[PDB]
A = this chain, B = another copy of it.
Amino acid sequence: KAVIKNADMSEEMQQDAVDCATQALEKYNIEPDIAAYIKKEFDKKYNPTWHCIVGRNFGSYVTHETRHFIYFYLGQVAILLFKSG
Chain A contact residues, CB within 8 Å of chain B: 30-36, 38-40, 48-63, 80, 84-85
Beta-carbon contact of A59 and B49 below 8 Å: no
**How near does chain B come to A58, taking the closest CB pair, in angstroms?**
3
A60 CA to B58 CA, complexed, in Å: 11
Query: With a CB–CB cut-off of 8 A, which chain B residues contact A53?
Result: 53, 58-60, 62, 80
**How near does chain B come to A48, taking the closest CB pair, in angstroms?**
7
**How near does chain B come to A1, taking the closest CB pair, in angstroms?**
18
Listed residue (A36, A52, A58) with the most chain B CB atoms within 10 angstroms of its CB? A58
**How near does chain B come to A33, taking the closest CB pair, in angstroms?**
8
- A58 in complex: contacting residue of B50, B54, B85, CB < 8 Å: B54
